[PDB]
RNA sequence: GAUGUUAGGAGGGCAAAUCCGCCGAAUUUAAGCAUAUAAUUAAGCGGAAGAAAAGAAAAUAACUAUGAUUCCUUUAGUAACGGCGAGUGAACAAGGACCAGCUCAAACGGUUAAUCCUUCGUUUGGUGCAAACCUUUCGACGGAAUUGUCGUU
RNA sequence: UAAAGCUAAAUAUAUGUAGGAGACCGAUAGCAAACAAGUACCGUGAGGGAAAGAUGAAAUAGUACUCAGGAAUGAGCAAU
RNA sequence: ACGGACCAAGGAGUCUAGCAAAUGUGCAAGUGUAUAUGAUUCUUUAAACAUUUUACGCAUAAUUAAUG
RNA sequence: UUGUGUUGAAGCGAAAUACGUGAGUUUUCGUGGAACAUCUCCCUAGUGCAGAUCUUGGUGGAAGUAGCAACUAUUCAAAUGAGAACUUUGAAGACUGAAGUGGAGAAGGGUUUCUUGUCAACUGUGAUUGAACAAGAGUUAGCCGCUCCUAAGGGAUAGCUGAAAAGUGUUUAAAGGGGUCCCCGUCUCAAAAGGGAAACAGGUUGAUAUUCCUGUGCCAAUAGUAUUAUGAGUUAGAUGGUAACAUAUAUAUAAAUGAACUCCUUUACAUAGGCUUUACACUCGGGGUGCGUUUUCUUUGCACUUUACCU
RNA sequence: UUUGUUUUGUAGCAAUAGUAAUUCGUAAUUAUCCGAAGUGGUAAGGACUAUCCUUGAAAAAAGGAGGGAACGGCUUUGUGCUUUGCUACUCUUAAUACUUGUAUG
RNA sequence: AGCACAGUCUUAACGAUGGAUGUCUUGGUUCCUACAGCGAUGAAGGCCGCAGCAAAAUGCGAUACGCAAUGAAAAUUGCAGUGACUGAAUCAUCAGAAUGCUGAAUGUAAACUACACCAAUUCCCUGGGAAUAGUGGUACUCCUACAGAAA
C-alpha cells in the first residue's frame, strides 16, 4: 500500500516498472482467485488502488512535461489549450467587445459622464 | 438460431447474466426476472 | 371514389416494364463521318430473340475507325438478313436489303 | 491533439485474464497437452500467442478461440511437443 | 382457409421487420428500408413530434447519464480558472 | 474560376418554458350551412439568447402641442369590421416603469492608404505554489486593399 | 425625411438547475411514478404503461429450548 | 318497461370573466387612490400602512346620422 | 377562544333506563397505542351517495357443479422414496411404420443444453418427474458458413426543385485505376438456398466436432539480396505427329520469352419426353464366423463379412 | 529393346482403422474380412428429340489467343549510343543465410 | 359415561378472509426568488463494461461503486479486509489526471466488432535502448492565406 506523495519524487522508470510489478502481482492474485484459493482475494482492492495511484502520478508527470514542452509557442495542441465552453471560446474577446473608433474615443475622453451634486 | 451476430450473442449473454438472483450475503443486511418461455426478449 | 387502374399505371410501381432478360435497346449506329460521306460495313454475327418484342435483333459488329477494335450494335433485323452477311451503312451504301441508307 | 498518458492498449495483463480450471480444461492438460486460458474478447490468435509467450516462456503450435456467453474469450492453447503442459500448469498452479 | 385470418396466419409470424437501431438501441430499426421508426437513425436529426409529450419525455435530456453536462454543472458558482488547483497544505 | 489530407478556422447535432421566421387545419359557434368563427390557433419546417424581438420617426397630432423602442394602468369592448348575423375589434392623447443614443452610405483628405490582417521576434509592468492570465509598444516579413481601407462630419 | 446598419433598461418565462414558502393532497389522493417508475409488462411499429409505503423505542431484542412430525408446521411446564 | 349479485372507498351546478337584481357596509355629488411610488416593516410581511393643495372609470345631462 | 390526551387520543366492534322528531349528538364496555377537539364567534372548501350496463379493489350464490373425451393400450415384478397408475430398471402386450413424435438444417427462440442437487410455487390428477428452482459447466475451423461478386432493388454524390422537410438520381460533372502522354472509370449496400480457392476417414466428451486427437491430404500466400541445388534454353526465346493433336514425372510434369493494344472462352443458366451409363439402395446364391429353432421338420432362420478424401 | 506365360498387391491410402468372433493378468493374443449374379428404387452424367407471339440473370474471378514493344555476360573509347580483348552464358522450382517492423493461415 | 335429527334462516360472542377507517409521510403540487446553453476540445441519447464475494437501482470508465488534490477527520464493516495514536478509514469539496464502443459521427461500411489508404508507432536514458499490427490522420460545405497548372 503506497501513497501518491512518496512516489511523486520518482523517475518515470521507478514509476513504470513499479507499475509493471504491481500489475504482475495483481495478475497473480487474479489467478489465485480463479483457482479455488481465496485466502488473498481481499488484497485485490489494495493492489488495484495502488495501480491507480501510480498511473495518476505518472500521467500527471507526463502532462506537466508536455505542458512545459509547449510553454508559450502560441500553437499548443487542442488538448492543451483552454477547455472552456465552445460558446465562450467563440466569444469576442473583452478587448474586441470594448474596442471603439477614434471618433467615439475622442468624444468620450473629452466629454465623460461626471460626478456632481445637486444642492 | 444457431447463426448469430456478435452483438446479438453478447446481448443474449447479458440477459442471461442479469437473470440471476440477489446474492444471499446481500439479502441478509429480484423483481426484474424473466423466464425464457414466459416473457420474450424481443431484442 | 378511389384512384382508378388507369391512373395507377403512371406511378410506375408494378407497371414498370418486365425487362430482366432484354438484350439491349435497338438503335442503329450513331452518325459518323464515315456514314455521312461514304459507307461502312459491319457483319451480322448473330440473330437473337429479345423477349419483350417479336422482331428479331441482329448483332452487327463494326470495326472501330477512331481506334483499333470492334463495336457491337443491336439492330432490328429486316427479313432476309442472315449471320455472316455484311451490312453497309452510309450515304454511298448500295440499295440492297439490310443496308442503312439516307432516305 | 497529443496524448501524454501511457497507452491504454491492452497489454498481456488484461489480454490474458486467468487460466481455466474446470474439469474439461483440467483433463485437456494431461490428455491433449493443451492449456485453457480466459481472455478479453479483444484478443486474437496472434495476441494470445505473443501474450502467453511473454507471460510464460512457452510457444504453442496453435490457438483455438471461442467467445462465451459470459462475456469473455476462451483460448485452447496447444503447447508444442518439445515441452509439456503439465510442468507449465505446475509452475502457474 | 387453414392459415386463416387469425390463429392460422399467426403461425406464419416469423421474420421480423425491426431490429435494434444502433443509435437509440430500441428495436425499431426497419430492416428493409434501413430507418429507425423511433429516432430516424440514418438521418441526422432525432425525429421528435410535439404531438407526443410522453414520447418526448421518455427520451429527452436527463433521461440518461448526462455524462458531461452534469460535470460542467456547478462550475458557474466556483469560477475556477482552468488549470488551477487548491493550494497545497 | 477549378484542384490541393497545403496552414489556420467555422457550420452540422441535442435541448425549448419564454423568443424569432415560415407553413397551416378541422373539430367548434352560427341552434342547419357555404362567407364568417374556431385562428393569423394546433400539428409540420427552420433559427437564437439569458432574455429574444422592437427601437432612434418617410411618428403623432391639429394642441398653449408631443418626441426612439418595450412593458403596466387606461383609452375601450370604444372607432371600426361582419350572411351588419353569430361574432370580431385597434390607434392617438393621459398616468407610470425604464430611460441612451449612435454609424455606414453619400460629402471632404492624393507634397503620396494616412488603412487592415498573417507569421516571426524584443521588452512593459502585474497578481498564481504551480498551471495559467492580464497589460505592453518597437519592429520585421508575407499578403489584402485604389473595383476604396482609414480619418473628418 | 423610406427604400442600409447597431443598440442597455423597464418585459416574458407549463424548460433545466438551485433556494424558500402555502387556509394545497395525504398512498383509489397528490405528478404516471412517496418504492429497483417511464420501471415491470404489452404492441412488428408509431406507441401504450401499471401495481406496489407503515413490526417494534430497540432486531446491536426477528423467535433460543423441548416434544410431536419425512417435512411444512403445531404445542409447550419453554421464550424476546 | 330499463338499471341494480354483494360490500368498501371514490363519484357530479363548480371556477373565472362580464351584467343585473336583492341585501349588508362605507362614503356621498361624488366615489373608487389604477399602474406606480415611500418607508428604521422586511420570519410572518406575497400583508399591513401611506400618497407636496385637474391620471382614469363610473356618476354628476340629454338628444341627434350629423355640423351640433 | 378554552380545552382532552400513556392513569390511553383518533379510529373501530357491540351497546345505552341517554337526548333529539330528525339528520344526528352524547355516553358505556371491549379493542386500540398517539394524537384530538373547540357549539365562543367567524372564515374556507376538492364538504354529505343506493343506483350512473358508474371507477378501483375485495367477495359471494351458481358449486364440490360444468368439467379434466382427438391421437386403439396397457400389465407383472423390482429399486428409490415420507409417499409411486403417470420416476428408474427387468419382463410382457402393443404403437409409430421411413409420407415416422426417426436423423440433419433454416426462420424464430435464447441457455431451454450438460452434470450435480432439488420440490415453495408451476408441471390443470399424482409426482420422488421436468423445458420448474439452485450451483457449477459446456460451443475449439486456412478447408463448414458469413465475410467477396453481382440480381430484383435500397442509400448516397452532381445537379435541379423545394421555406425547409424532403423529391429525383447524370438531366450544362473539370467525378480512382493502368501502363509511360495517353487509356479506362459515380460511390456504396443488397443472396448463411444464385456465382464462389481448399478435407477426408477412424477415434474422442457429461455436454463440441468435416472445428478436438491420430493419420493422411489440399488451397492460398510466400519481399529484397546472396549462396547452393533441380531442371530446361542458348553460341533472342525447345521438340514430336500427315493430321486430329502430343510432349517438362525434377521428392514437386516448375520453367516451352513475350509489352501496348485487341478478340474470345469459362463463370453461365428453361421446360417435356424417353433411351442409356455409373454410383448408392435393395435382393439372390456360395464360403467362413457367431447366435437362434430343434415334440416333429429344416445341409435351416438371422447377424457380420467394411474401405474415405487425396495420388 | 517388343510379344506371350507366372508371382505379388484389397494400386498407394490399408489395416495399423472398422466389424463380427475365440481366448488370456484384467491391458494383450488369435482367426475372418472373398466367390458369382439379379431387380430398378434414388441421384448424377451422357447423347438426343420436342415446345414457346414464353427463348429461360449478372458480376467477381479464371483462362486462351491475335500482335510483336524490350533484349547476352566481364572490361574499356568518347558521347543510353559504333567501337576494341575474352566466353562457358538466361529463365524455373526448392532450401539456406542476412536485411526487411514481428516474413503463415 | 351419556344427551342432542339434519338442513335453512335470525341473533350474540369469538375467530377467518379482506384491507376500509384513523394516525403517520425523506413524496407530490402550486406560487415566489435567482441563474442559465451543451456540442468536432466530440454533446444529448444509446450500448458495453467496472466491486473479493455483486442481479437491479445508484456511481463510475481499462486508474472503472472509484485516483489525485483540498477541508473535515477515526472509523468502515454481512463476512473477508483496510485504517492514526493524520495525504492513510470514512465523509464533503472537487480545479489535477483519466474518461471504453458509439452517437451530428465525420475514411468506406453496418442485423459485419467487415474493408481501405497515408505516416510505421509508442515508451525509456541523456545520441543511444527497448517494445509493439499497436497509434494517429483521411467526410461534406464554407472562409482567410498559400501552392502549382489554365486563356
mmCIF file of N, CA and C (backbone and C1' of nucleotides) in Angstrom, chain F residues 31-55:
data_model
loop_
_atom_site.group_PDB
_atom_site.id
_atom_site.type_symbol
_atom_site.label_atom_id
_atom_site.label_comp_id
_atom_site.label_asym_id
_atom_site.label_seq_id
_atom_site.Cartn_x
_atom_site.Cartn_y
_atom_site.Cartn_z
ATOM 1 P P A F 31 -78.284 31.043 -35.938
ATOM 2 O "O5'" A F 31 -78.770 29.562 -35.653
ATOM 3 C "C5'" A F 31 -79.222 29.164 -34.367
ATOM 4 C "C4'" A F 31 -78.402 28.013 -33.861
ATOM 5 C "C3'" A F 31 -78.390 26.782 -34.770
ATOM 6 O "O3'" A F 31 -77.077 26.240 -34.861
ATOM 7 C "C1'" A F 31 -79.026 26.174 -32.585
ATOM 8 P P G F 32 -76.367 26.112 -36.290
ATOM 9 O "O5'" G F 32 -77.363 25.217 -37.135
ATOM 10 C "C5'" G F 32 -77.303 23.804 -37.079
ATOM 11 C "C4'" G F 32 -77.674 23.193 -38.402
ATOM 12 C "C3'" G F 32 -76.667 23.392 -39.517
ATOM 13 O "O3'" G F 32 -75.617 22.451 -39.468
ATOM 14 C "C1'" G F 32 -78.808 23.952 -40.301
ATOM 15 P P C F 33 -74.094 22.933 -39.445
ATOM 16 O "O5'" C F 33 -73.892 23.587 -40.871
ATOM 17 C "C5'" C F 33 -74.023 22.827 -42.059
ATOM 18 C "C4'" C F 33 -73.869 23.717 -43.254
ATOM 19 C "C3'" C F 33 -72.660 24.632 -43.201
ATOM 20 O "O3'" C F 33 -71.492 24.018 -43.700
ATOM 21 C "C1'" C F 33 -74.579 25.913 -43.643
ATOM 22 P P A F 34 -70.062 24.607 -43.316
ATOM 23 O "O5'" A F 34 -69.755 25.637 -44.484
ATOM 24 C "C5'" A F 34 -69.857 25.230 -45.841
ATOM 25 C "C4'" A F 34 -69.707 26.378 -46.806
ATOM 26 C "C3'" A F 34 -69.476 27.759 -46.194
ATOM 27 O "O3'" A F 34 -68.509 28.463 -46.967
ATOM 28 C "C1'" A F 34 -71.334 27.826 -47.645
ATOM 29 P P U F 35 -67.089 28.845 -46.329
ATOM 30 O "O5'" U F 35 -67.103 30.432 -46.267
ATOM 31 C "C5'" U F 35 -66.832 31.208 -47.420
ATOM 32 C "C4'" U F 35 -67.166 32.663 -47.214
ATOM 33 C "C3'" U F 35 -66.507 33.351 -46.037
ATOM 34 O "O3'" U F 35 -65.168 33.716 -46.282
ATOM 35 C "C1'" U F 35 -68.777 33.937 -46.105
ATOM 36 P P A F 36 -64.127 33.767 -45.072
ATOM 37 O "O5'" A F 36 -64.995 34.184 -43.814
ATOM 38 C "C5'" A F 36 -65.030 35.525 -43.358
ATOM 39 C "C4'" A F 36 -65.888 35.659 -42.130
ATOM 40 C "C3'" A F 36 -65.305 35.110 -40.846
ATOM 41 O "O3'" A F 36 -64.389 35.997 -40.238
ATOM 42 C "C1'" A F 36 -67.530 34.382 -41.063
ATOM 43 P P U F 37 -63.179 35.426 -39.365
ATOM 44 O "O5'" U F 37 -63.885 34.554 -38.245
ATOM 45 C "C5'" U F 37 -64.547 35.157 -37.145
ATOM 46 C "C4'" U F 37 -65.050 34.107 -36.195
ATOM 47 C "C3'" U F 37 -63.982 33.212 -35.604
ATOM 48 O "O3'" U F 37 -63.384 33.789 -34.465
ATOM 49 C "C1'" U F 37 -65.769 31.895 -36.407
ATOM 50 P P A F 38 -61.819 33.632 -34.223
ATOM 51 O "O5'" A F 38 -61.661 32.126 -33.760
ATOM 52 C "C5'" A F 38 -62.380 31.615 -32.653
ATOM 53 C "C4'" A F 38 -62.359 30.115 -32.662
ATOM 54 C "C3'" A F 38 -60.992 29.491 -32.839
ATOM 55 O "O3'" A F 38 -60.278 29.410 -31.624
ATOM 56 C "C1'" A F 38 -62.524 28.468 -34.310
ATOM 57 P P A F 39 -58.686 29.534 -31.613
ATOM 58 O "O5'" A F 39 -58.402 30.935 -32.297
ATOM 59 C "C5'" A F 39 -57.077 31.435 -32.392
ATOM 60 C "C4'" A F 39 -56.781 31.987 -33.761
ATOM 61 C "C3'" A F 39 -57.857 32.890 -34.354
ATOM 62 O "O3'" A F 39 -57.232 33.889 -35.149
ATOM 63 C "C1'" A F 39 -57.460 31.094 -35.805
ATOM 64 P P U F 40 -57.074 35.387 -34.613
ATOM 65 O "O5'" U F 40 -55.707 35.864 -35.263
ATOM 66 C "C5'" U F 40 -54.504 35.150 -35.039
ATOM 67 C "C4'" U F 40 -54.107 34.352 -36.253
ATOM 68 C "C3'" U F 40 -52.680 33.838 -36.282
ATOM 69 O "O3'" U F 40 -52.549 32.632 -35.556
ATOM 70 C "C1'" U F 40 -53.263 34.772 -38.387
ATOM 71 P P U F 41 -51.110 32.055 -35.161
ATOM 72 O "O5'" U F 41 -51.434 30.987 -34.035
ATOM 73 C "C5'" U F 41 -52.160 31.341 -32.871
ATOM 74 C "C4'" U F 41 -52.983 30.183 -32.379
ATOM 75 C "C3'" U F 41 -52.353 28.818 -32.561
ATOM 76 O "O3'" U F 41 -51.433 28.496 -31.540
ATOM 77 C "C1'" U F 41 -54.562 28.759 -33.353
ATOM 78 P P A F 42 -50.229 27.488 -31.841
ATOM 79 O "O5'" A F 42 -50.934 26.076 -31.980
ATOM 80 C "C5'" A F 42 -51.477 25.415 -30.852
ATOM 81 C "C4'" A F 42 -51.949 24.035 -31.218
ATOM 82 C "C3'" A F 42 -50.928 23.168 -31.923
ATOM 83 O "O3'" A F 42 -50.031 22.553 -31.024
ATOM 84 C "C1'" A F 42 -52.957 23.084 -33.102
ATOM 85 P P A F 43 -48.501 22.329 -31.425
ATOM 86 O "O5'" A F 43 -48.571 21.341 -32.661
ATOM 87 C "C5'" A F 43 -48.894 19.976 -32.478
ATOM 88 C "C4'" A F 43 -49.128 19.299 -33.799
ATOM 89 C "C3'" A F 43 -47.984 19.376 -34.786
ATOM 90 O "O3'" A F 43 -46.954 18.446 -34.529
ATOM 91 C "C1'" A F 43 -49.960 19.973 -35.880
ATOM 92 P P G F 44 -45.434 18.940 -34.501
ATOM 93 O "O5'" G F 44 -45.043 19.067 -36.030
ATOM 94 C "C5'" G F 44 -45.310 18.023 -36.949
ATOM 95 C "C4'" G F 44 -45.009 18.467 -38.352
ATOM 96 C "C3'" G F 44 -43.694 19.199 -38.527
ATOM 97 O "O3'" G F 44 -42.592 18.326 -38.652
ATOM 98 C "C1'" G F 44 -45.393 20.450 -39.534
ATOM 99 P P C F 45 -41.192 18.716 -37.991
ATOM 100 O "O5'" C F 45 -40.620 19.831 -38.958
ATOM 101 C "C5'" C F 45 -40.302 19.530 -40.302
ATOM 102 C "C4'" C F 45 -39.805 20.750 -41.026
ATOM 103 C "C3'" C F 45 -38.663 21.490 -40.364
ATOM 104 O "O3'" C F 45 -37.407 20.880 -40.572
ATOM 105 C "C1'" C F 45 -40.297 23.036 -41.028
ATOM 106 P P G F 46 -36.326 20.850 -39.389
ATOM 107 O "O5'" G F 46 -35.806 22.347 -39.302
ATOM 108 C "C5'" G F 46 -34.950 22.858 -40.303
ATOM 109 C "C4'" G F 46 -35.019 24.359 -40.418
ATOM 110 C "C3'" G F 46 -34.280 25.164 -39.378
ATOM 111 O "O3'" G F 46 -32.878 25.140 -39.525
ATOM 112 C "C1'" G F 46 -36.356 26.156 -39.768
ATOM 113 P P G F 47 -31.960 24.962 -38.229
ATOM 114 O "O5'" G F 47 -31.880 26.423 -37.627
ATOM 115 C "C5'" G F 47 -31.751 27.543 -38.481
ATOM 116 C "C4'" G F 47 -31.891 28.827 -37.719
ATOM 117 C "C3'" G F 47 -31.260 28.850 -36.351
ATOM 118 O "O3'" G F 47 -29.858 28.970 -36.398
ATOM 119 C "C1'" G F 47 -33.380 29.839 -36.236
ATOM 120 P P A F 48 -29.001 28.712 -35.076
ATOM 121 O "O5'" A F 48 -29.163 30.073 -34.285
ATOM 122 C "C5'" A F 48 -29.075 30.127 -32.878
ATOM 123 C "C4'" A F 48 -29.460 31.492 -32.385
ATOM 124 C "C3'" A F 48 -29.239 31.757 -30.911
ATOM 125 O "O3'" A F 48 -27.902 32.078 -30.600
ATOM 126 C "C1'" A F 48 -31.399 32.423 -31.477
ATOM 127 P P A F 49 -27.259 31.572 -29.229
ATOM 128 O "O5'" A F 49 -27.816 32.592 -28.151
ATOM 129 C "C5'" A F 49 -27.688 33.990 -28.335
ATOM 130 C "C4'" A F 49 -28.461 34.750 -27.291
ATOM 131 C "C3'" A F 49 -28.126 34.425 -25.851
ATOM 132 O "O3'" A F 49 -26.997 35.140 -25.397
ATOM 133 C "C1'" A F 49 -30.463 34.416 -26.135
ATOM 134 P P G F 50 -26.228 34.678 -24.075
ATOM 135 O "O5'" G F 50 -27.295 34.860 -22.911
ATOM 136 C "C5'" G F 50 -27.259 35.985 -22.045
ATOM 137 C "C4'" G F 50 -28.623 36.323 -21.498
ATOM 138 C "C3'" G F 50 -28.702 36.445 -19.982
ATOM 139 O "O3'" G F 50 -29.719 37.383 -19.646
ATOM 140 C "C1'" G F 50 -30.178 34.777 -20.695
ATOM 141 P P A F 51 -29.484 38.967 -19.749
ATOM 142 O "O5'" A F 51 -30.940 39.521 -20.050
ATOM 143 C "C5'" A F 51 -31.376 39.733 -21.382
ATOM 144 C "C4'" A F 51 -31.720 38.442 -22.078
ATOM 145 C "C3'" A F 51 -32.141 38.573 -23.525
ATOM 146 O "O3'" A F 51 -31.040 38.714 -24.399
ATOM 147 C "C1'" A F 51 -33.624 37.122 -22.403
ATOM 148 P P A F 52 -31.036 39.858 -25.518
ATOM 149 O "O5'" A F 52 -31.900 39.236 -26.681
ATOM 150 C "C5'" A F 52 -31.664 37.914 -27.122
ATOM 151 C "C4'" A F 52 -32.759 37.479 -28.042
ATOM 152 C "C3'" A F 52 -33.382 38.603 -28.835
ATOM 153 O "O3'" A F 52 -32.553 39.109 -29.879
ATOM 154 C "C1'" A F 52 -35.092 37.387 -27.837
ATOM 155 P P A F 53 -32.894 39.001 -31.436
ATOM 156 O "O5'" A F 53 -34.309 39.682 -31.612
ATOM 157 C "C5'" A F 53 -35.206 39.183 -32.584
ATOM 158 C "C4'" A F 53 -36.507 39.926 -32.559
ATOM 159 C "C3'" A F 53 -36.398 41.429 -32.572
ATOM 160 O "O3'" A F 53 -35.925 41.996 -33.792
ATOM 161 C "C1'" A F 53 -37.882 40.838 -30.899
ATOM 162 P P A F 54 -36.870 42.690 -34.878
ATOM 163 O "O5'" A F 54 -37.463 43.964 -34.153
ATOM 164 C "C5'" A F 54 -38.818 44.322 -34.339
ATOM 165 C "C4'" A F 54 -39.188 45.449 -33.428
ATOM 166 C "C3'" A F 54 -38.342 46.692 -33.575
ATOM 167 O "O3'" A F 54 -38.809 47.512 -34.625
ATOM 168 C "C1'" A F 54 -38.528 46.124 -31.295
ATOM 169 P P G F 55 -37.787 48.147 -35.672
ATOM 170 O "O5'" G F 55 -37.246 49.431 -34.922
ATOM 171 C "C5'" G F 55 -38.145 50.367 -34.358
ATOM 172 C "C4'" G F 55 -37.486 51.130 -33.248
ATOM 173 C "C3'" G F 55 -36.118 51.688 -33.570
ATOM 174 O "O3'" G F 55 -36.193 52.908 -34.278
ATOM 175 C "C1'" G F 55 -36.066 50.617 -31.468
#
